[PDB]
Amino acid sequence: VGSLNCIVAVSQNMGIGKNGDLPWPPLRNEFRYFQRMTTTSSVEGKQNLVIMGKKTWFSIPEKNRPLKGRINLVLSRELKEPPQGAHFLSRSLDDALKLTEQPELANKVDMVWIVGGSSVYKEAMNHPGHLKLFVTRIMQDFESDTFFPEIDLEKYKLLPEYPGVLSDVQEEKGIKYKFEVYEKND
Ligand SMILES: NC(=O)c1ccc[n+]([C@@H]2O[C@H](COP(=O)([O-])OP(=O)(O)OC[C@H]3O[C@@H](n4cnc5c(N)ncnc54)[C@H](OP(=O)(O)O)[C@@H]3O)[C@@H](O)[C@H]2O)c1
């Protein structure tokens, strides 16, 4: 089981969601970036694992659940079984990560990607050990009802570049944004 990663897109006012959807209009290449980063496995024969909260799961259109080419795991304390289309369900991020050591997953999983929402990011960013945060900074304010927790700059370093990730300003639909990568290893 490989690295532990968070990936998020966040507006200038720290918003990540609004009424069960994204706060901004669809950004095709931000979506393509999300898909490629979470799907690409460095190891032949393995897939990455995506971990998400219950509301993030149901925010994906039904025709696109589960996220293709990745092993999907949902966090919830209320659901008694994985929702339809999913095969894994844990009560906490800690439980989910311990689950990746069991035989059914240990040999199938390469990278682990936390893909939201807010309380999943929060549990991960406080998780001890080696963590990377792939953060898209959308350079506008958008009305939001769900937010990304602030990064503790006493623990994380901002990398100037990351392999395979463009470091310059992007723009689609009139909206500028930038791909950032933070790292810690405590
Ligand atoms: N911009 C982005 O990068 C991005 C990413 C993801 C989602 N989104 C947006 O954000 C919204 C969804 O995120 P959200 O924060 O509202 O909800 P969420 O985190 O996806 O779902 C919340 C629920 O998931 C479970 N949960 C979450 N964190 C948990 C944890 N650490 N341990 C155990 N269970 C946990 C709980 O379910 P139970 O009550 O059943 O226990 C909780 O009520 C949508 O608007 C979506 O479009 C945006």
Ligand SMILES: CCc1nc(N)nc(N)c1OCCCOc1ccccc1C[C@@H](CF)C(=O)O
């Ligand atoms: C692209 C946003 C994003 N960007 C970064 N960088 N990190 C993230 N975690 C992230 O959320 C991914 C959440 C999964 O959403 C989907 C995956 C497949 C099909 C459709 C959706 C839902 C629509 C709108 F709800 C969407 O979200 O594109």
